[PDB]
Amino acid sequence: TKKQKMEVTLRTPYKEYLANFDGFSRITAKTNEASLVIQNKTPASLYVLPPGPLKIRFTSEVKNVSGDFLHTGGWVIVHADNTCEINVMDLFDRKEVRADQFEKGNIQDLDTLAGKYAAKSRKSTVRLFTKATT
Amino acid sequence: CIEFAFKKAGIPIVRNFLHSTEGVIYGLPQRVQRNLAINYTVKQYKEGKAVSAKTIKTLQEAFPSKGD
Amino acid sequence: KITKAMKMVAASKMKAETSRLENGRNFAVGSVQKMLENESYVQKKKSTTAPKSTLLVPITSDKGLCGSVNSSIVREVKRLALNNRSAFGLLPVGEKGSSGLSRPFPDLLKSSIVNIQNVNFPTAAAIAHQVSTQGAGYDQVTLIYNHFKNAISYVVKHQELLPRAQFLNLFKYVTRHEAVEPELEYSKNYFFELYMASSVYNALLNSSASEQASRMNAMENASK
Amino acid sequence: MLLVKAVKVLVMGGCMLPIAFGALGTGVLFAGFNVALSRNPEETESLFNNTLMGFALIETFIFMSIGLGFFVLFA
Amino acid sequence: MLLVKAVKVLVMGGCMLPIAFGALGTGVLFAGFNVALSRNPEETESLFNNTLMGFALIETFIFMSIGLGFFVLFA
Amino acid sequence: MLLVKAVKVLVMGGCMLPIAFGALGTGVLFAGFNVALSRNPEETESLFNNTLMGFALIETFIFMSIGLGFFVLFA
Amino acid sequence: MLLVKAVKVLVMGGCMLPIAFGALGTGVLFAGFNVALSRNPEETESLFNNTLMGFALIETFIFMSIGLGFFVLFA
Amino acid sequence: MLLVKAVKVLVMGGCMLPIAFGALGTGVLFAGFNVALSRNPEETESLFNNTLMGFALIETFIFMSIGLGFFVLFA
Amino acid sequence: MLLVKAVKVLVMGGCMLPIAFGALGTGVLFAGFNVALSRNPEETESLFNNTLMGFALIETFIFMSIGLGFFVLFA
Amino acid sequence: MLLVKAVKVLVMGGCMLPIAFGALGTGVLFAGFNVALSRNPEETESLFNNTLMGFALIETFIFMSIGLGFFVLFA
Amino acid sequence: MLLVKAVKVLVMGGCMLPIAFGALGTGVLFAGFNVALSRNPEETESLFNNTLMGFALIETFIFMSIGLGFFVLFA
Amino acid sequence: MLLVKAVKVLVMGGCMLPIAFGALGTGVLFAGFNVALSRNPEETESLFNNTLMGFALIETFIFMSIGLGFFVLFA
Amino acid sequence: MLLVKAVKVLVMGGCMLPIAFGALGTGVLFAGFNVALSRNPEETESLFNNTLMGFALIETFIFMSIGLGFFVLFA
């Protein structure tokens, strides 16, 4: 019916990072259209984020999480009871990017209608990831 | 583009994300790399066996599409 | 002897699978269902019928001598379908389930998925895509799998999922949660993919853990 | 005299510009009401009430204008 | 006299500006109605009704205008 | 007299402003129709009808205007 | 003299342009209020208050105008 | 006489305002068409047709205007 | 003399156009404030402050105008 | 005579308002083209062609205007 | 002389139109600032600075105008 | 005669309205360019070129205007 | 002569309308810049440059106007 302050839950199929959390102050990610910012009282909404960066500021430091990451792609829901859950395929820290190792044999693609869009997305995210390290 | 990739081709979002990783798999840690693997087998049943091996997983193997 | 060694390695396998479940459980489960329930307008315009035809996807382990769990799954689905026929597509998963269901339900089971190298979310999403393609024929889908509540206790459980067509007709009503960064027309298929994949992934994890645990228990028994 | 009366009547005529702008404001308001209702129908009544509220206030302006007009026509 | 009558007919002419703005408001209103309908068609009638409602009120203004015009032409 | 006729024809000329605003409103309306069609094509017919409806009423205003014009040209 | 009085009353008439623009601003404001309320109804009151606040300030302008009008009518 | 002809030709000149507003409406309409096409290209033809349709109706208004102009220039 | 005073007071009247446009700008600003608040309520105060800030700057214009007016009325 | 020529040349001057509105429409159209291109770059060429089409039709109006101007300048 | 002085002060009055349009532009700018801040609060300061920057440039126009005014009042 | 020259220079002055509308169109165009660039930065150059293209065509109008102006100043 | 000078200075005054429209265009441009920056902050600088570019072109118009103004004031 409503939620005091706010709770976030950030989960990955292989590990859950914040089962539930109030300590964060703000969340910023990038959608296709534009970069979005989620805080408390933010209205209910659905988002789908391509493999961009995800940063969350913490009031209190959380052990083993950095607060700035790179996800491979995710779904984000902001429910009615002031609660946002982030579900991503996989997530990692910017420092482990190990950039300049890209394009090691999967450059090859097939020319169809789908291979074109797939290459488009691949280049977009390669560019984005290169930029993020800076 | 995820939206037009789905609209003008039958590309699921998981497939699009996977394509996106394809170029960057080696930059990522091995922990992430090990998860992005699809290898299974489909058997047709008419009281008989016809066996397809689903390993491509980005093209029309795991997720068929209009564009393919 | 072979029983003891098989049990000992199955112990480690079961440990790994239990850890994987603990980490992967409750990944985006109930989420879309929750948000949908929160939408009152959806509930006003929701189509409320009983599915006449549904599609059953049993989930069994491929390796033999894993215990009586596969037997339980095939027994439940056999009861459910032998009772009334032509109301189920019966897309099986796992070698043992398909093999056990061949003779009892010919012409009901047309294809199955076997020889899964490992469990991961991409794989479960592929399975979700297959079931979704086969879901158009049936007004409901349901999944039968063992639930790993305890190391020595596995309980058969069946989840009910609405198919892509019904899900989309329901989702088009959604208005309390906005979707403009991706448009609603894309977002509905997208969150349907999520909604099916999460359930399938949870099912796979629970089934794997239950398989390993049951194999360990039965190997101890046979050693005894 | 005659010229004062002339400019008086000219102002009384100019009174119709607020009517034009009130019509345009009504159009904009009801366009917003339609789009909002489609976006979230559940609370039509609320929107509806607020919508009607706005329109009332619009015609408040309008009547003021004509008041002014009549005033300057006779004062 | 003649000059007063002249400004009288000029005001009766000025009566046509509200018509212009009502036309533009109608255009905007029906554009909003179109967008709303595309978003969520189910409530055509509601949108439709509300649209017509707004439009009716528009011509209220218009008729008021012409009333004034005739008034100023004869009073 | 002569000046009254002059201002009469001037009003009949001023009659063209509603035409301008109706043209602009039509442009806006059809832009909205285009956008709506792109957002959800399935309901072409509905949009189309509603669009045309609006346009009819627009030129209704316009013709009303010219009516007034002729009146002021001859009355 | 007489001509000064004429232009004085003409200004007092010109006082009606702010009323027109305030009406249009009110329409725009309440359209925005509707859209916002539909997007997030929970804070109607807040929006509502702010809305009314804005409208008050709108008519502030108006009164200033009429003040000026009366001033130039008598000063 | 001379003055009537003067105001006649002045009205014939005023005939160009609808042309301006039709140009602006065309610009807005084609901007909407562009946005719609980008949003959903598959149905270009339909949008295109409707777009052109709209434009015709726009210049319909315009032509009416010039008719009036010539009329008042010669009647 | 009288004619200079006439155009002086006419300008002092023309001073009301900025008031009209400030009213419309206030309406637009508060509509934006409403929409923004609905999008992200947590930082109402900030928006509110900025909103009020804008309005202050708006009335700056207004006062400047009237300043100018009085200047040209007396210089 | 001379006075007719005066109003004739004044109309030929008034011909410049359509040019202004065509400039604004071109700006709006190309803004729409830019936004559309960002939304979906793949079909630049298509948008581009359609864009130019609109602009051509815009200047059609413009030339019509000047045609009228010269006509009214000599008839 | 008298007429030159009249049109001089009339232009100095016309100087108030830029003030009106600057007020409206300020309103629009701060509405955009509000919506932008809601969309992404983290960089308020930047937006804020740019906003104020814009406003400064706005008043540049205004001062230019008044400069011109005084110039034409004395040259 | 002399009066013809007066209206000639008045038209040459009226030539500045297209400049105003071109300025506004440029502002709108570059706002659209900014938004588009943010939406998809990768193709700045393309947008940039198209932007410049639009602006060129804008100033085309402007030059046409002054051409006309000079023409009417000397013919 | 004297009257020619009067209309000359009147045009030099009319030169202020482009300033008003440039102010409004600047407001719109910087609103777009704010929104654009919020959508994608990373490339502020680029937007910033482009923004300033646009603004320069805006005031280009302005200077043209004043050039014209002085020209018509002295030619």
Author numbering:
A (entry chain d): 24 to 157
B (entry chain e): 2 to 69
C (entry chain g): 41 to 264
D (entry chain O), E (entry chain P), F (entry chain Q), G (entry chain N), H (entry chain H), I (entry chain M), ...: 1 to 75
Question: What did the article's authors report about this structure?
Answer:
The F-type ATP synthase (F1Fo-ATP synthase) is responsible for generating most of the cellular adenosine triphosphate (ATP) from adenosine diphosphate (ADP) and inorganic phosphate through rotary catalysis. In eukaryotes, ATP synthases are found in the inner mitochondrial membrane. The type III ATP synthase was detected in ciliates where it induces tubulation of the cristae membranes. In this study, we present the cryo-EM structures of the type III ATP synthase dimer and tetramer with associated lipids from the model organism Tetrahymena thermophila in complex with the natural inhibitor IF1.
Using masked refinements, the resolution of different regions reached 2.5–3.1 Å, allowing de novo modelling.
